[PDB]
Symmetry: C2
Subunit: 400 residues, 2 copies
């Protein structure tokens, strides 16, 4: 007799997000509101395919003549467009050929590729991430055998970035450790360093010898494409080495096509080309080469003046809708009688903020009013609309 290889495996814990989504689906109330979603929604509550994307997909259907494998690093034009978005069209990094980009299956894939590359080719042992954390970071880095440590970030009592605690906590990060920064729209707080704080962090990193890793999944959702990259660029002006994991899931509405990139920056072209050869090996041992459809949509849009303009307007529309919902939420809470300051909501960037509500209050909102947020009190402001704002805010006031 041979015991089965799977016979004694312990089940993984159930996905609590999936559970909450099922509870929301079962709720019979016509007034139910779901602020626990993780993606953008428009004014009608849909997560539509962008029009620029539909147009790009029509062009591909018309023009594609093969599905032969891409190179390991993906579509060359997609790589160039990515570097321009990250560093700016006239960048010294680009001119000096200091950066190399691999197209990856989403920003999550980019993070895994970065982790595997670091674990097998460098002495990196630790990655520092902010508190509160984006849970997937830990799973990805740990899978490669890298430890993850948290640095202080969010001050929940005061709804702010406690910069002094941040700097303090980071003194414990050693030379050669990785420190991870969200480029913009910090997830889940929506609190980003000011440009002056970015510059301060950039100097501290050079000083302490950290390897910065930027997670860039919301470019364009804070203020604009170029503006949202200033923090990254402040680091790039100062650093010999960077890694950037970027995603087009959010800003192109391309979630399920898995469109992202991993970008290495080194002191010079000779060094980055050498490093990148090992990043390619890490990709080859994983999924071989990346999925074409989504990245080709992105390259198609970015390289065509007319399409690019359509897409830039769609992204501006999404950004402006989120800002409109942030303002309206604050104003409506005041109007409905919250008699309490929620103004921090206006100073936060992107889809997510902590509401400041307690676990108890969040539970009451669900049970008593059919308003769904995650237990942490994080809300997705894109789940708000002119249509549902009033009842949402009445319910919130009722539990304060």
């Amino acid at each position: 007799h041979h015991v089965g290889t799977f016979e004694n495996i312990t089940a993984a814990p159930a996905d609590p997000i999936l559970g909450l989504a099922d509870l929301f689906r079962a709720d019979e109330r016509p007034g139910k509101i779901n602020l626990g979603i993780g993606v953008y929604k428009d004014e009608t509550g849909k997560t539509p395919v962008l029009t620029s994307v539909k147009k790009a997909e029509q062009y591909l259907l018309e023009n594609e003549t093969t599905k032969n494998y891409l190179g390991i690093d993906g579509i060359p034009e997609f790589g160039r467009c990515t570097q321009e978005l990250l560093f700016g069209k006239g960048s010294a990094l680009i001119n000096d050929k200091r950066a190399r980009t691999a197209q990856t299956p989403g920003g999550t894939g980019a993070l895994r590729v970065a982790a595997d590359f670091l674990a097998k080719n460098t002495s990196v042992k630790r990655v520092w991430v902010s508190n509160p954390s984006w849970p997937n970071h830990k799973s990805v880095f740990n899978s490669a055998g890298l430890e993850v440590r948290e640095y202080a970030y969010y001050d929940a009592e005061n709804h702010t970035l406690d910069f002094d605690a941040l700097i303090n906590s980071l003194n414990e990060a050693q030379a050669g450790d990785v420190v991870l920064f969200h480029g913009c729209c910090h997830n889940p707080t929506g609190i980003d360093p000011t440009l002056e704080q970015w510059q301060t962090l950039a100097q501290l990193s050079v000083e302490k010898g950290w390897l910065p890793l930027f997670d860039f999944a919301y470019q364009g959702f804070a203020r604009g494409l170029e503006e949202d990259a200033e923090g990254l660029r402040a680091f790039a002006a100062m650093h010999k080495e960077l890694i950037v994991a970027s995603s087009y899931s959010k800003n192109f509405g391309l979630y399920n096509e898995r469109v992202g990139a991993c970008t290495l920056v080194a002191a010079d072209s000779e060094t980055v080309d050498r490093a990148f050869s090992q990043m390619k090996a890490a990709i080859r041992a994983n999924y071989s080469n990346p999925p074409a459809h989504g990245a080709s949509v992105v390259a198609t849009i970015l390289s065509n003046d007319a399409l690019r303009a359509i897409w830039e307007q769609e992204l501006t529309d999404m950004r402006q809708r989120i800002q409109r919902m942030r303002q309206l939420f604050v104003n409506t809470l005041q109007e409905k009688g919250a008699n309490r300051d929620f103004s921090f909501i206006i100073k936060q960037n992107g889809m997510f903020s902590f509401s400041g509500l307690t676990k108890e209050q969040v539970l009451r909102l669900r049970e008593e009013f059919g308003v769904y947020a995650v237990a942490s009190g994080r809300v997705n402001v894109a789940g708000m609309t002119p249509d549902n704002m009033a009842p949402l805010c009445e319910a919130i006031v009722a539990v304060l």
Copy 2:
């Protein structure tokens, strides 16, 4: 600097060769070193069933919101039916779970990570020779790769005694990898009786079989090409299958594959699959929809499926025709020795039996490109290039 002392990866000789071919000004150049299917015009076209399905998707898709970790459920159902047969006892007993993955390579990786983190598997046995990327994928998960005997290069055969004897070294709990059909790169597959002998031996020895199935439909047909796997499924408690639709749908760059787990019963496979999902979440989160949606759309639609099956038949038939034309043309050109084995082999690849010296000669003197191993891809052959190709082969 953190990147300062990084040692460069070795040059990829396959890419180097393709670069060479591209940078060859000689007009009669022929590339038999390709890794994909080519039609009689030398193109790797998008299938008509695929273009039709892509049009359905353009109309029906109203969102790109994330798929679940295991991908599109109909894609998994259709995959299990292709592998095991509709009304299979396995499927009826709910013993199988399937995750859609980024190609068969992604499936192999997901399998390797799942095994490394959740089981006592330490070693994977692969045939000598075979797909060079098996070692990189399993090694990346910290699994050792050992090789078992398979191919007798002088006699152009599967040396079955050597196979069996060499696997005596595989321990209970080791994984043994089998190609489901069109063994890559020999094109030599076990007969049904040999598959049945291996299935029985594998149960006695306690091996965990892992089937790599990237060419279903290219040997004899969809159901025939799965008979080996199904012989294993008849008697094994556990199996893993890494399958690919890159080849049989011509969907290479859309990264369409699946990792299927089979356990003794439904509750067991649920536990195992929960941890496979964790391994996916920590890699690429959830899989790319477009390619897999094309496959599910075709396989679940009678009309499109019929178009696709004919296209697959046409590809299989073109390969068979090139194998025969190659042999007959070699003889006409007064080759010399018996290349008959070329007719007996399955899929796009065979070893030509040419020594490495002979291969260099072909590239340098005749601009005919093959791999150093002597491997050729017969889909690189066409009626119009066969004579020139075979003249050059004769000359060496």
